[PDB]
Design a protein around this ligand. Structure first.
Ligand code: ADP
Ligand code: ADP
Ligand code: MG
Ligand code: MG
Lengths: 118, 160, 74, 371, 371
């Protein structure tokens, strides 16, 4: 068919894909918010003696430091993920740089205007 | 008219007036405004930004194919939007990556023609044997059993 | 890879993340305020770690994609 | 700030700021003292006209190139040329700009050390780096492999490179270049009656060579054709009239490249030193070098050389390999474009020879890690 | 979870998940540092290309195998090979998968102990087990008796087994294998003019050996025929052209297996060490071993070896016994297929060397009950 027709249909497909991606992103944002709400438990501190609430808070503090440890674990893992991402990007870029080395430059800066000064 | 009026606004009514003045400059003039047909070649000679031969072929297909002897104002602005740079910059590499990842629901590291058909039909566009098969001939250049990553990454280069 | 070094780094960071506060120097309303503050802090912790997991999933998918494409090279 | 990508060359000095497409100022590298007496008083006559100014007053000067074959033989004149290049053709003081000179392969060390000493003491640049003239020409082509034949005006050298790893044992440097072709053309023009002797008339012979000469696809057939018909005789108007007609001198001048026995040189032509340079390489990268043969330098601009060279190499090489000769239209400035690209890189930004380093190790720093 | 059936080998590392038919990733085990200087900046040049990547850039590398004869001589390179195998060819972290290495018979203890120490400390696997390379090849044939001749690329060993009871006093390990045949072929090619010296050209000679050489049914008749006619001369195209013609070098290279006196080795050929290995067995299981002779390993893929070996053994053996040579078409991966079958068994699931056991007894656990 005509190239313009195929291009337009491709454009429509890409726009629809972007719309679906944005809707799924909204869904994931709301779902993450709600699930994070589920992870955190409600606190009812009314009518609590000093010892009772103090123990509760100390338990919360211990759990907080546990969360710190788990976040350190997942952060080390995510740093590994970022490192291997950089390595993959480097290798792919090298494979493309078998034929794309001088692609980074700027040409025709200021000389193309200077023509008749001589 | 959606794509057509989008192109119209690409060279908006200000650009429309600018090109109307330019047309009055290069047109035959001193006439009834019957509007010639060679004026699209006259502007090609005049502005210096000569439309590509592909644009001239599009003009011949769209106009003068029936011996009109004139180019319609809508078709004239169609040709004008075919000459000025209303580029879409081919989106971005990350945006293409996201769109292809969503096309690769199977997470196969490439797109299948079944994936192509499903993504196209999720848009509601009539995807018949005139499509996919033509896209096998056209959309997929390699046709090496699937749509490889560079195949569709480079396929959507400089497109909307 | 020198898991002694990694554990040392873990100890340093956890000591940074270490937070120990007064527990017997506040009244009931102050105690409840501190409990609520800790709840909100660890709630931010939950949200951030959910972000960490989700971004890790996305990164892992991209790693799969890049590995697949570099295997499609040959 | 921006870097100055100078390129001394031998015959044309090409310079300009890093990151552009073409050199800003290109002018012959000649310094000519006046030779007659001079009777007008107060005319404002200088003692040495350099650069493009001495190509307009060449009627009463004695032009002399300060660079013979890559190497520099007259350091005062070269310093004068550099001073002119910095101050009058670019108008940027060197105190605020890094410089990236270029040097032919296999040149004497003392030349390079003196070059860096001058750049650091007289002009007092912040940091300078010296690069081999062939790696840049490989940059400009956007490749990363290939064997580049950079036939300049001083010296023709042939550096093979694979995957970014240069092969130092396969560099074949030959000293036949554009200047020897100019001298040989000036010597064979005497067979028709035209005698050019003065160092100023060498420029006229150079113009004749540039505008008329071409490389024949097959030498014997052209020699036979030019000796029977007269379809080749092209005429040319001297700077004063008296047009001249060049017959079979047209393709005999640049033929010296493929048969250096014409000017008495023993070595083999540029068609066979490339094949020898390839054969010294390892057995597994010869296909890639065959397929990515790169031409550069001014003298490779003769009309019809990219076909003669391909025919010759295809004759020499095994029949299965594909021989391809990359001849970009921007051949003359290929080295400088590559120099601009290299100077514009972020990864390269820490390879400059910083001035404090020179102060600690002396001019011999250039041979060290900062190459 | 699933088990990782790795198989170090010597020449080709074969790996894949347990329970499949063929290894997932097969690639040469070579680690080659670059040897030239390298002039392109920012090309992303690594310091060591391992596996199949160094078989494409071998023109500028110095490939060196980390496993000489079964034993491992360079532990850092072997660790690099394992790391590549786990992370890039299979993309499965070893923290969640048992491993089943393979080892030749009669190898030094320190090699095996270091192997298990690496697998438990660096890669930190849950549990690993080391198995003799011949028992697996017997698994893959679906037998339970038979004497298996596993002529790999590093070392040729001949383990007889009856009814599942291995005979430790009848294992005959000989160090002639594919690598020595490659070296001998490279040494006899010089008799026609072709000289291969570089460690990269050893790969080319290996390809010649794989594609052209064959084992002669009768050696003297072939030597006489190749010296009169010219029906044997097969040509082959090098990686750059210049085809070569192999004459009676075709069947002289693999003949070294049956006459190890060619490369100066004293011992008897693979046709007579099998008979000697049988004769050391008891008098009542010799018929079964005669009838179930199994071939395995890469080097036993020469066209026409399953007939030469049968003829030789029939000459040696008593006339009444039937001599049968099992030569499955999937010979090369026979060891790995057997490894997959063994790792997929339920009865075997409690033989792994669990990590807590290693923590209690140290690396010397491998010689203990968990063999
Ligand atoms: N268009 C041309 N045709 C033929 N020869 C040329 C042409 N342009 C330049 N040359 C020759 O090349 C020389 C210039 O070479 P160039 O590349 O400037 O040398 P360098 O490497 O020193 O810069 C001139 O001396 C001239 O003889
Ligand atoms: N088709 C073949 N024909 C002849 N020889 C082969 C063939 N395939 C492999 N070989 C030889 O066998 C070797 C591979 O043996 P292999 O079984 O991989 O050893 P390992 O036991 O270390 O895995 C190669 O070095 C090669 O010399
Ligand atoms: Mg040059
Ligand atoms: Mg084996």
């Amino acid at each position: 068919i005509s190239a313009s027709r195929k291009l337009q249909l491709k454009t429509l497909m890409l726009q629809i894909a972007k719309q679906e991606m944005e809707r799924e992103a909204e869904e994931r944002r709301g779902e993450k918010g709600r699930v994070l709400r589920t992870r955190c438990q409600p606190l009812e501190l009314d009518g609590l003696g000093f010892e009772e609430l103090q123990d509760l808070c100390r338990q919360l503090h211990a759990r907080v430091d546990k969360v710190d440890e788990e976040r350190y674990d997942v952060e080390a893992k995510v740093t590994k993920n970022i490192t291997e991402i950089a390595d993959l990007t480097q290798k792919i870029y090298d494979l493309r740089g078998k034929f794309k080395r001088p692609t980074l430059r700027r040409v025709r800066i200021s000389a193309d205007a200077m023509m008749q000064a001589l | 008219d959606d794509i057509y009026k989008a192109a119209v606004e690409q060279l908006t009514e200000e650009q429309k007036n600018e090109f109307k003045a330019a047309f009055d400059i290069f047109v035959l003039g001193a006439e009834d405004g019957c509007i010639s047909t060679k004026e699209l070649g006259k502007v090609m000679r005049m502005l210096g930004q000569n439309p590509t031969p592909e644009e001239l072929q599009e003009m011949i297909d769209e106009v003068d194919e029936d011996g009109s002897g004139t180019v319609d104002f809508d078709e004239f602005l169609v040709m004008m939007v075919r000459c000025m740079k209303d580029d879409s910059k081919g989106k971005s590499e990350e945006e293409l990556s996201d769109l292809f990842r969503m096309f690769d629901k199977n997470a196969d590291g490439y797109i299948d023609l079944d994936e192509l058909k499903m993504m196209l039909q999720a848009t509601g566009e009539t995807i018949t044997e005139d499509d996919i098969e033509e896209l096998m001939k056209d959309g997929d250049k390699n046709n090496d059993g699937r749509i490889d990553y560079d195949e569709f990454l480079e396929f959507m280069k400089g497109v909307e | 890879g020198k898991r002694q070094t990694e554990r040392e780094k873990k100890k340093k960071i956890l000591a940074e993340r270490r937070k120990v506060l007064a527990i017997d120097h506040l009244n009931e309303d102050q105690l409840r305020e501190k409990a609520k503050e800790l709840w909100q802090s660890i709630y931010n912790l939950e949200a951030e770690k959910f972000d960490l997991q989700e971004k890790f999933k996305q990164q892992k998918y991209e790693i799969n994609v890049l590995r697949n494409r570099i295997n499609d090279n040959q | 700030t921006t870097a100055l990508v100078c390129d001394n060359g031998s015959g044309l000095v090409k310079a300009g700021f890093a990151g552009d497409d073409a050199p800003r100022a290109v002018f012959p590298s000649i310094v000519g003292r006046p030779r007659h007496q001079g009777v007008m008083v107060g005319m404002g006559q200088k003692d040495s006209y350099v650069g493009d100014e001495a190509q307009s007053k060449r009627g009463i000067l004695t032009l002399k190139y300060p660079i013979e074959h890559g190497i520099i033989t007259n350091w005062d004149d070269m310093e004068k040329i550099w001073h002119h290049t910095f101050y009058n053709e670019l108008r940027v003081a060197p105190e605020e700009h890094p410089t990236l000179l270029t040097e032919a392969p296999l040149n004497p060390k003392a030349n390079r050390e003196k070059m860096t000493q001058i750049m650091f003491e007289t002009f007092n640049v912040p940091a300078m780096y010296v690069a081999i003239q062939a790696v840049l020409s490989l940059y400009a082509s956007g490749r990363t492999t290939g064997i580049v034949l950079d036939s300049g005006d001083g010296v023709t050298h042939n550096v093979p490179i694979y995957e970014g790893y240069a092969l130092p044992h396969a560099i074949m440097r030959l000293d036949l270049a554009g200047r020897d072709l100019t001298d040989y053309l000036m010597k064979i023009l005497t067979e028709r009656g035209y005698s050019f002797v003065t160092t100023a008339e060498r420029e006229i012979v150079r113009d004749i060579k540039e505008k008329l000469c071409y490389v024949a696809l097959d030498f014997e057939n052209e020699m036979a054709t030019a000796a029977s018909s007269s379809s080749l005789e092209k005429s040319y108007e001297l700077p004063d009239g008296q047009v001249i007609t060049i017959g079979n001198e047209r393709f005999r001048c640049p033929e010296t490249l493929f048969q250096p026995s014409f000017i008495g040189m023993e070595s083999a032509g540029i068609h066979e030193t490339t094949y020898n340079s390839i054969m010294k390489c390892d057995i597994d990268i010869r296909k890639d070098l065959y397929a990515n043969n790169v031409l550069s330098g001014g003298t490779t601009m003769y009309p019809g050389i990219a076909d003669r060279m391909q025919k010759e190499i295809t004759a020499l090489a095994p029949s299965t390999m594909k021989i391809k000769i990359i001849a970009p239209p921007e051949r003359k400035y290929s080295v400088w474009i590559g120099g601009s690209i290299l100077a514009s890189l972020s990864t390269f930004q820490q390879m400059w020879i910083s001035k404090q380093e020179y102060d600690e190790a002396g001019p011999s720093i250039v041979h060290r890690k900062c190459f």
